[PDB]
Design a protein around this ligand. Structure first.
Ligand SMILES: [Mg+2]
Ligand SMILES: [Mg+2]
Ligand SMILES: [Mg+2]
Ligand SMILES: [Mg+2]
Ligand SMILES: [Mg+2]
Ligand SMILES: [Mg+2]
Ligand SMILES: [Mg+2]
Ligand SMILES: [Mg+2]
Ligand SMILES: [Mg+2]
Ligand SMILES: [Mg+2]
Ligand SMILES: [Mg+2]
Ligand SMILES: [Mg+2]
Ligand SMILES: [Mg+2]
Ligand SMILES: [Mg+2]
Ligand SMILES: [Mg+2]
Ligand SMILES: [Mg+2]
Lengths: 107, 140, 55, 97, 120, 190, 95, 100, 287
RNA sequence: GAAAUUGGGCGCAAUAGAUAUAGUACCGCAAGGGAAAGAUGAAAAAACCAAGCAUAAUAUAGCAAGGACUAACCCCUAUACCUUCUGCAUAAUGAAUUAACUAGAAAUAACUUUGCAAGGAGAGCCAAAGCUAAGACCCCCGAAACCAGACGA
């Protein structure tokens, strides 16, 4: 509901549109298991799409960690110190491209 | 018990996290919290229609008040802004009524001007030259 | 017992029983098991046709 | 609070145990051992259900008629009552008929 | 018993006062009806609900073109309290395949086959 | 699942000890109606739909589906590049370290299913080498199956085991419906 | 009926059904009409001709009798001079 | 031992020389390998020279010498995925670590 | 197969890659949730929610359908009636033309069952094979069949081509030895003697028209002349051609197998035959 | 309802598993009934989380919320849940609350997916495309009673 959840006013970070537009997403942090069906579509995302994504916006620095994880995560860190950790557990490559592009588009 | 439930704390905490601001034992006990949390969600969805309704009647109250400041009433103002093809809606006219009252005064003079052109128009029946603000813009 | 490219046999039966019905008969290749499932009784006709094809 | 505060001790499993590594060997002892044995002779268990599958009423009727002579007395009595209940349940109660 | 209702033919014979009131012509009548369901078929009998399904009037306030023929008009005489009937008038001609997409039916009843969005 | 027998059995409410009379009268006390202290609602009562007895999950597939499952396993292990065919399972030494280093040199896999023709005629060298190992296994050709072919990463046959498998699995295709079991004497089967 | 017996654990037939009805192998049950031998002095000969007829059963009657018999009674029977042997196979349906 | 293979720049003429060391006619690329001695000597000499053996799944796939020549001039390369990603010309904002 | 070529690149098939054929395993439906259980499928609290609907066929109190109807002897003596599995001549032409039944040897019932062209079961009271006139035209086979019943047109269709058909009788015991003889020789019993027909089948198997195995062998050319004149074929004499010694041999009654005798004990293991020499046993088995 | 005839754990782990730490304590004249529970560490010769309270009582007004709001309330909207009914806010039933336990078991026939196919099946059984295999449908508590054998004046 809305009375149990906090609320806020619609703002931007440092007047994000006025002078120039600044990409608000600093770091992505993929942690992808080498052997494991949970991070399969993550692996196919690293083999295919994370390089073209990394070139389509160079203001984002990307850390693929490749450790023996049991649930893969992506950790979006934003310019204002906000850290949104979302799971890419058992998600296909297209769904991780829409998820990572969703984290890139927002603030 | 061969397989009995281990993950049950988290189902109770799925329901009870929405109850953390209730009174009584509704914030604490699961049997009471399920009924009040279900009921709070049903009110939460049925109140979207009431949000739209109450915003619109609130705008009609604000347009009514600020049009009573200029001598008009609400139905003369809205009907005669429709009849000028100035198709501003209620939200915008309430926001002009609050923040930009010269524009709302000029919309009130445009609407009352068109109202008097309707009075003088329906007064002198038969063929007469039309009003100046009474003309319509034909689209094709 | 179809071993090979089942779609070519589906195309040849699709071009064989369509004069015997008018409409093209609805089939179902099961490319795993290697079968092909035509709707309607065409047993003696397909046994004669597959004996003409030399199998 | 019916949940445990500490994580349990870890479950080590040896996948190359003697039982796990040679599991399933001589299941095809009929189809490539010249059919001298049937694989239902390869299973070990109760003597009334080596090579046989039934529901509960059938398992208890077969249990009584095969090994019921040398069963213990209140096991024989409990088993007669179970056959009598499961008779009255399967043959008289139920939705589909 | 509330039954189905028949309507005599003198009800559907127009008068010159009606021919002057509504802009119709008895000689050379119109070809196509615009029909619009404007009254819910709930709290109505099942035959009327069926006719409203047969005419494609399941959504309210959506126009539907029918023929001005006595069979279609028989179905429209069944549900005449649930609909609105207007003639489809065509100022310009019926649209060719060149003007097929750039049409718009106006609220007056006319199908304008050259539909810009520009003022005169 | 066919060898599986589940020894789980719980007590029903007639087998659990005691509890023969009503605990309190039917209408006097304002407590609930109960008939025994051993009904499935009580702490200590019987189980309603628990597991009942040793239950055997026995079922045979047709033997053509088992033999076709062995065939299918052999084409899968061959086409995955996991089939290896020897001429004989004779090692130079009876040491396990030679066999593991050989299997790491040829990059077979972490687990090897060595298969010879019988159990009596296996050479002593492969017996002393594989009898100390967890992941390398000797089966005779009689004990070939599908679970242990999928369990092991490579499968290693010899040529007489291959001729044995062609004999046995190519027999199931082009053979009649039986009249009586194949253990009985026929005209040409043994 | 008995869905599971106490000795073998099989289905049992209702022997009344066997003693009154005739399973044809197509699935049709053949019966005799009720009252075909009672009070014939007061029946018209058209009605006497109607009562002396072998009569097929309904769909639901046929399912009811199939459930009350076991698989022995649903079986091909190659008798010598059976009078109903030509009625077992169902010729020339179009569903 | 490495599974990495590079086709030689003179693989054609070597392979024709091994066909001549086994045999010889015109259209030497169209010689049928139905004889098993022929196939074992030819693919044994190619497996011995080139350090790269035809696998069991592909061994019945060559029935002419043309298919042998088609198999031996694909670069089969084996390297770890740490060495396949991080040497794939990464942009300067991909940093890839490996806890292996 | 290009699917093996797909299997090269795909990973190894293990016990973690298996997956049933989609469509085989329907999901288990079990009464938890909003939909599968509140009343859990049974309805409202009547007598079918409680679980105690009456037996199958009880119509609520009126006399049921299966009892309002008079008993008639449809199935009165069903397990004493004789059954006879059909052998059409299209079927036996199919068996002879595919090597499954050898026409250069006499066609016993052992030879039909070992050819697996006719499956008969001695339990469920099949008394053997009956000949069937289906496919009597387009039957081109010179043959020596022994079939327990035979129609006139099947005897005509076989004897046209130079065939011999006689009708034998078998007990259920004897026919149980004729069907599957090899589980009889592993039983250890001596070979019994097949009995005579009972009183109703005796006038069947002594008539030469339907070719009894107990009939006059002086009336057979009259009966073959009768079927030759009835169906229009010049009756060939079997005495001329060169399978005649094969086409003449019948095992006599009280002999189950062709070359064996009653009282003999076949030892399948060391491949021998034990034959009695006691005189009382010979007065028993040669009776 | 025959016969001839034939031939160690995909267990439980302290409300579970035995009633059992014990047929003890206790109840009953007796026959009989029948419990509950323990958790340190190698050596004692060494936190966080159920209800319930407390920290910290209360502020006009109303199924205890929801829309919101600068703002907890004030504004507006809103006839607890289950069950049984034609219809329950119903002043009909049940429920103090927390934890743990506590209720859909299977047949022939049909259907889906394989295998083989005029045959199927590892005998027996079915077969006028069938047969074999698998998957998938059938609850819980409650009488007053009746009978048998004991225990009781
Ligand atoms: Mg009891
Ligand atoms: Mg009370
Ligand atoms: Mg217990
Ligand atoms: Mg009852
Ligand atoms: Mg009555
Ligand atoms: Mg017996
Ligand atoms: Mg206990
Ligand atoms: Mg206890
Ligand atoms: Mg607390
Ligand atoms: Mg209020
Ligand atoms: Mg009400
Ligand atoms: Mg009630
Ligand atoms: Mg009250
Ligand atoms: Mg109440
Ligand atoms: Mg109460
Ligand atoms: Mg006294």
């Amino acid at each position: 509901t809305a009375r149990g959840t906090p609320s806020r006013f619609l703002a931007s970070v440092l007047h994000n549109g006025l002078g120039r537009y600044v990409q608000q997403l600093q770091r992505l942090s993929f942690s992808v298991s080498r052997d494991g069906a949970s991070s399969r579509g993550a692996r196919e995302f690293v083999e295919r799409e994370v390089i073209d994504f990394a070139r389509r916006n160079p203001g984002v620095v990307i850390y693929v960690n490749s450790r023996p994880c049991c649930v893969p995560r992506v950790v979006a860190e934003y310019l204002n110190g906000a850290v949104r950790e979302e799971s890419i557990h058992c998600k296909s490559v297209e769904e991780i491209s829409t998820l990572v592009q969703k984290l890139a588009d927002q603030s | 018990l061969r397989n009995r439930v281990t993950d049950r704390y988290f189902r109770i905490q799925e329901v009870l996290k929405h109850a953390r601001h209730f009174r009584g034992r509704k914030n604490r006990c699961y049997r009471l919290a399920v009924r009040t949390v279900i009921r709070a969600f049903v009110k939460c969805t049925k109140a979207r229609y009431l949000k739209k309704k109450n915003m619109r009647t609130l705008w009609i109250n604000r347009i009514t008040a600020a049009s009573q400041e200029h001598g008009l009433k609400y139905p003369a103002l809205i009907g005669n802004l429709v009849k000028c093809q100035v198709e501003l809606n209620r939200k915008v006219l309430a926001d002009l009524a609050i923040y930009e009252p010269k524009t709302f005064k000029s919309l009130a003079a445009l609407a009352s001007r068109r109202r008097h052109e309707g009075f003088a128009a329906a007064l002198g029946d038969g063929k007469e030259p039309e009003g100046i603000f009474s003309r319509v813009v034909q689209y094709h | 017992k179809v071993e090979g490219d089942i779609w070519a046999l589906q195309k040849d039966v699709e071009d064989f029983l369509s004069p015997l019905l008018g409409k093209t008969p609805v089939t179902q290749v099961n490319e795993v098991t290697g079968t092909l499932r035509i709707k309607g009784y065409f047993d003696q006709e397909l046994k004669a046709w597959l004996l003409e094809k030399g199998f | 609070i019916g949940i445990r505060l500490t994580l349990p001790p870890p479950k080590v499993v040896d996948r190359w145990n003697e039982k796990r590594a040679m599991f399933g060997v001589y299941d095809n002892i009929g189809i490539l051992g010249n059919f001298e044995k049937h694989p239902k002779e390869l299973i070990r268990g109760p003597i009334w259900l080596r090579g046989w599958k039934g529901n509960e009423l059938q398992r208890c009727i077969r249990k009584r008629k095969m090994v019921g002579s040398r069963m213990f007395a209140d096991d024989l009595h409990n088993l007669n009552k179970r056959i009598r209940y499961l008779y009255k349940h399967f043959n008289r109660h139920g939705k589909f008929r | 018993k509330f039954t189905r209702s028949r309507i005599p033919e003198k009800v559907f014979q127009a008068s010159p006062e009606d021919h002057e009131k509504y802009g119709g012509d008895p000689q050379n009548p119109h070809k196509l009806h615009i029909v619009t369901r404007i009254k819910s078929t709930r709290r109505r009998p099942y035959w009327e609900k069926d006719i409203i399904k047969m005419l494609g009037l399941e959504k309210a306030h959506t126009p539907q073109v029918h023929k001005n023929i006595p069979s279609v008009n028989a179905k429209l005489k069944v549900v005449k309290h649930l609909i609105r009937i207007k003639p489809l008038k065509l100022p310009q001609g019926l649209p060719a395949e060149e003007n097929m997409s750039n049409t718009c039916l106006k609220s007056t009843g006319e199908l304008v086959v050259q539909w810009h969005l520009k003022p005169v | 699942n066919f060898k599986r027998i589940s020894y789980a059995k719980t007590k029903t409410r007639a087998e659990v000890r005691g509890g023969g009379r009503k605990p309190w009268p039917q209408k006097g006390t304002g407590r609930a109606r109960h008939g025994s202290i051993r009904s499935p609602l009580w702490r200590g009562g019987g189980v309603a739909h628990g597991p009942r007895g040793p239950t055997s999950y026995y079922y045979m597939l047709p033997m053509k589906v088992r033999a076709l499952g062995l065939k299918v396993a052999l084409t899968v292990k061959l086409a995955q590049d996991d089939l290896h065919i020897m001429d004989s399972l004779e090692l130079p030494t009876g040491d396990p370290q030679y066999l593991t280093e050989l299997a790491h040199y040829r990059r077979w896999g972490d687990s090897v299913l060595l298969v010879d023709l019988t159990h009596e005629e296996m050479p002593q060298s492969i017996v002393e080498a594989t009898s100390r190992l967890k992941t390398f296994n000797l089966i005779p050709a009689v004990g070939l199956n599908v679970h242990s072919m999928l369990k092991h990463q490579t499968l290693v046959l010899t040529l007489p085991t291959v001729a044995f498998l062609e004999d046995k699995l190519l027999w199931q295709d082009s053979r009649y419906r039986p009249l009586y079991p194949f253990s009985l004497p026929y005209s040409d089967f043994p | 009926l008995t869905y599971f017996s106490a000795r073998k654990g099989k289905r049992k037939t209702v022997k009344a059904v066997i003693d009154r009805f005739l399973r044809l192998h197509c699935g049709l049950w053949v019966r005799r009409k009720a009252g075909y031998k009672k009070k014939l002095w007061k029946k018209t000969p058209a009605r006497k001709k109607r009562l002396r007829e072998f009569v097929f059963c309904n769909k639901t009657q046929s399912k009811l009798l199939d459930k009350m018999t076991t698989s022995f009674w649903k079986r091909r029977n190659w008798y010598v001079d059976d009078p109903y042997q030509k009625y077992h196979d169902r010729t020339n349906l179009k569903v | 031992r490495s599974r990495a293979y590079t086709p030689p720049e003179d693989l054609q003429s070597r392979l024709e020389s091994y066909v001549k060391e086994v045999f010889l006619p015109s259209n030497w690329q169209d010689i049928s390998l139905e004889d098993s001695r022929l196939k074992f000597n030819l693919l044994a000499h190619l497996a011995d020279d080139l350090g790269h053996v035809v696998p069991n799944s592909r061994l019945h796939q060559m029935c002419r010498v043309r298919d042998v020549l088609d198999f031996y001039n694909v670069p089969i390369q084996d390297r770890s995925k740490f060495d396949e990603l991080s040497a794939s010309n990464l942009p300067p904002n991909l940093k890839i670590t490996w806890s292996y | 197969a290009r699917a093996l070529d797909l299997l090269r690149g795909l990973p190894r098939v293990s016990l973690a890659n298996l997956k049933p054929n989609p469509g085989s395993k329907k999901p288990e439906r079990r009464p938890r949730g909003r939909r599968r259980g509140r009343k859990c499928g049974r309805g409202h609290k009547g007598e079918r929610q409680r679980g105690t609907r009456p037996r199958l066929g009880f119509e609520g109190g009126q006399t049921p359908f299966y009892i309002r109807i008079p008993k008639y002897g449809f199935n009165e003596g069903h397990s004493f009636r004789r059954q006879y599995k059909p052998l059409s001549l299209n079927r036996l032409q199919y068996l002879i033309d595919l090597g499954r039944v050898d026409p250069s040897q006499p066609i016993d019932l052992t030879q039909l069952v070992n050819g697996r062209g006719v499956t008969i079961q001695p339990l469920k009271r099949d008394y053997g094979v009956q000949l069937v006139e289906e496919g009597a035209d387009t039957f081109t086979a010179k043959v020596n069949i022994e079939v327990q019943l035979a129609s006139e047109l099947a005897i005509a269709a076989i004897e046209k081509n130079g065939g011999v058909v006689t009708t034998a009788f078998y007990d259920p015991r004897s026919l149980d030895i004729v069907c599957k003889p090899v589980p009889f020789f592993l039983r250890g019993q001596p070979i019994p003697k097949r009995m005579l027909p009972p009183e109703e089948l005796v006038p069947y198997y002594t008539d030469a028209k339907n070719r009894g195995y107990l009939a006059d062998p002086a009336k057979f050319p009259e009966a073959r002349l009768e079927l030759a004149r009835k169906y229009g074929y010049i009756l060939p004499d079997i005495t001329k051609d060169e399978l005649f010694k094969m086409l003449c041999t019948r095992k006599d009654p009280r002999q189950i197998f062709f070359g064996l005798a009653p009282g003999w004990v076949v030892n399948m293991a060391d491949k021998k035959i034990l034959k009695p020499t006691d005189e009382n046993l010979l007065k028993y088995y040669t009776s």
